[PDB]
Amino acid sequence: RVRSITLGNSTITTQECANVVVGYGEWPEYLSDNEATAEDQPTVATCRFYTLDSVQWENGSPGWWWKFPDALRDMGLFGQNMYYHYLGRAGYTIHVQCNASKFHQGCILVVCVPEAEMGSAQTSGVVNYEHISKGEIASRFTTTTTAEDHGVQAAVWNAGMGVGVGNLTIFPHQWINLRTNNSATIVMPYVNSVPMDNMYRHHNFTLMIIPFVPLDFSAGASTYVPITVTVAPMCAEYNGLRLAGHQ
Amino acid sequence: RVRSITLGNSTITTQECANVVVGYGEWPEYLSDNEATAEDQPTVATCRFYTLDSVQWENGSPGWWWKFPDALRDMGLFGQNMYYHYLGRAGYTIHVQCNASKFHQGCILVVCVPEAEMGSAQTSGVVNYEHISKGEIASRFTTTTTAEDHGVQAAVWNAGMGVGVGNLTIFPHQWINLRTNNSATIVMPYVNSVPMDNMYRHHNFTLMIIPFVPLDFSAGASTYVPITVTVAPMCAEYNGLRLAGHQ
Amino acid sequence: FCGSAMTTGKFLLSYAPPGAGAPKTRKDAMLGTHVVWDVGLQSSCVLCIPWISQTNAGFVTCWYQTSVVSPASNQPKCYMMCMVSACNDFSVRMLRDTKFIEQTSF
Amino acid sequence: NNHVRSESTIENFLARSACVFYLEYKTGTKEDSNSFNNWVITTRRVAQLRRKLEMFTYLRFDMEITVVITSSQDQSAPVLTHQIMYVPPGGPIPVSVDDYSWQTSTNPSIFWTEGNAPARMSIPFISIGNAYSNFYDGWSHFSQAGVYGFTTLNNMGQLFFRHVNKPNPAAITSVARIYFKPKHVRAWVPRPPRLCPYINSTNVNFEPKPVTEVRTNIIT
Amino acid sequence: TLNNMGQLFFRHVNKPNPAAITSVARIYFKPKHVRAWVPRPPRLCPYINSTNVNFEPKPVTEVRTNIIT
Secondary structure, three states, rough: EEEEEOOOOOEEEOOOOOOOEEHHHHHOOOOOOOOOOOOOOOOOOOOOOOOOOOOEEOOOOEEEEEEEOOOOOOOOOOOOOHOOOOOEEEEEEEEEEEOOOOOOOEEEEEEEEEEEOOOOOOOOOOOHHHOOOOOOOEOOOOOOOOOOOOOOOOOOOOOOOOHHHHHHHHHHHHEEOOOOEOOOEEEEOOOOOOEEOOOOOOEEEEEEEEEEEEEEOOOOOOEEEEEEEEEEEEEEEEOOOOOOOOO | OOEEEEOOHHHOOEOOOOEEEEHHHHHOOOOOOOOOOOOOOOOOOOOHHHHHHHHEOOOOOOOEEEEOOOOOOOOOOHHHOOOOOOOOEEEEEEEEEEEOOOEEEEEEEEEEOOOOOOOOOOOOOOOOOHHHOOOOOOEOOOOOOOOOOOOOOOEEEEEEEOOOOOHHHHHOOEEEEEEOOOOOEEEEEOOOOOOOOOOOOEEOEEEEEEEEEEEEEEOOOOOOOEEEEEEEEEEEEEOOOOOOOOO | OOOOOOOOEEEEEEEOOOOOOOOOOHHHHHOEEEEEEEEEOOOOOOOOOOOOOOOOOEEEEEEEEOOEEEOOOOOOOOOOOOOEEEEEEEOOOOOOOOOOOOOOOO | OOOHHHHHHHHHHOOOOOOEEEEEEEEEOOOOOOOEEEEEOOOOOOOOHHOOOEEEEEEEEEEEEEEEEEEEEEOOOOOOOEEEEEEEEOOOOOOOOOOOOOOOOOOOOOOEOOOOOOEEEEOOOOOOOOOOOOOOOOOOOOOOOOOOOOOOOOOOOOEEEOOOOOOOOOOOEEEEEEEEEEEEEEEEEEOOOOOOOOOOOOOOOOOOOOOOOOOOOOOO | OOOOOOOOOOOOOOOOOOOOOOOOOOOOOOOOOOOOOOOOOOOOOOOEEEEEEOOOOOOOOOOOOOOOO
């Protein structure tokens, strides 16, 4: 018993029941504020699944993370609208799911952290762009403290922010625990101080996946379980670019 | 007394009265035939002016011609849809207009010839692509017969088709005669044997401009009058590219 | 898909419109028309492709999205078949003789 | 007059019989060089005919082909039977007097004997297009590099002719002359008349010519 | 005894006379008012005998250079 959601030009099959967790209990919207007579802005054909490259999960892997909207910067038409518009906004629907037998075990945490600000490997350096992003390729945490020329101070058990890793369930989150689940859904609305801002310059939230109980398998069976993430924009808007004038 | 037509993202100011000549008395349409259950096709944001480069008109210039739709092959989004679709159709609105004082004189003929088939410079050769097209740059006729490795047998007074040049007014046409007019409009619908065909492989019609009475000017005054053409697609369609299936 | 009942994978089926070359990467294929077909839920998929008639013509391509997950099988041979038929309305005109048999011989 | 004309209808401006070809063949073995002969159906062979079908850009019609055939012996038998075979375009064709392309079941054929009213049959509109094209402005290939004009457009079948009797002493030579007329014409989009004499039979190639005759002076 | 139909014979009706005459008669055949019941898959192997369905094994299809595009 399954149904297949489709957003047109893309389709993905999902388990019938898996629950959705709406972050802060509000769906993506188009803003309805007036005084846009002097700054009119149009709403769109970007509302389709984009499937990022799958990553291995193997026993003793420490975690992964990506930063939006700068992980979709090379994807299709949505990447063009970070470059032909100076301001934007957009909510997201994120399905994280994976395969697995019934002989596997372990559970992982899926969380979206608005405004995750990373440390720096040495305690007086400043992290640079290339070490805090990796495009649509997953970045990763590491166990065991080690220096880097810039680098994020990854540690897993501080989460790169110097907070308890067990307390990250304050943000919108889902557990994917093998022997029950194998999928999760988080719908994340646009949260920022200002209503719109430059896509390139800023990051809105950082998806993270942290294994707690690590992968293991009974006699025989594959030594890895692949994970896949799929992200689709919802209710996006961008600044105008039309004169309000005439001849 | 003027009004300015606008097709959104483009605007052009036109003289209030100048008449439109609808070629064969039918406007561009979307086809309404059924049995497109097995070959569904979607209709669009290409419906905007495209202004081609202006050409000089000077005393003793012999004429010009362009071939559609292969003169708009580098233009914007409309050029992308000759490359992401295997079949298409589209009517056109063409405004030809020019400047001039009241001290100039002469008149030119504007005509659109469906299925204009060109000769070849030698009478046993075969014309090649590069000599019968020049992209969005105007090609030109020449007075005085001369050979070419391929070439069109241009002559003006045969019109490159071995017919009287005085009898080209059988096709949709407008005279632009200085001392009255300075503009013309031809709306040309899609005319072909088959309902849709490949944009690159075929040419639908050849715009031509032939001076009869040549440019001349009274004491002082500029020695050239510039001509400009502007072409906007109307009611375009292209073949589908969606499965009719399901999971 | 005719593999075992404990095998699970995901494939990305893809279709290219006529007058456009085959995709060269799974990334390319994905941005085209594609149906993600999960083996482990569905055991078949039907694509109904419009607009065939007679080079230029579309392409059908299948791509791994994930590698297959074996139960414990020691030969990882799994297979899939493909079937084809005309769909709904169809038309032909103008009879002519087939090219696959050549003359008498007796 | 006293009413609207009807001698200048499209249907009466066309649809007149005209000779378009004639050919010869003679009784003889399959070894013999000429012993069957063919003609490809085209309307560009005859200049006079060609002129009046280049008045329009698109046409669709059925056509009637009547062949009238005579024969004569040459210097020193039963009545001869002639076969005329129409091959629709994309069929098999014979390369010799004896082939299985005269025995094929999907090619219409007329057996006819001398001393009868001449054979004819109509061929109905054949083309996947919705009209024949008398002008074309493209290339055969999907990238421009094909053959310019008259590619797969304006392609119709072809006839073949042979005697049906066995060879016998004293050669017989036949001459068959072909008459052609269209019927049920419909024309779309007119053209200005051709002004320069035809050169090739597959191109619109032409040699420049004066527009009009000289006058002695423009004033009267 | 299935698929048994008659047969034709041909002769001249005149008396023999000096100088042989040789005739060639060619037969054309068509059915009319057909009705068909139960379809079959098309024959794939060239016919051998004219009274048996005997055949010599043949490849299903032409080779390709590789299955991937």
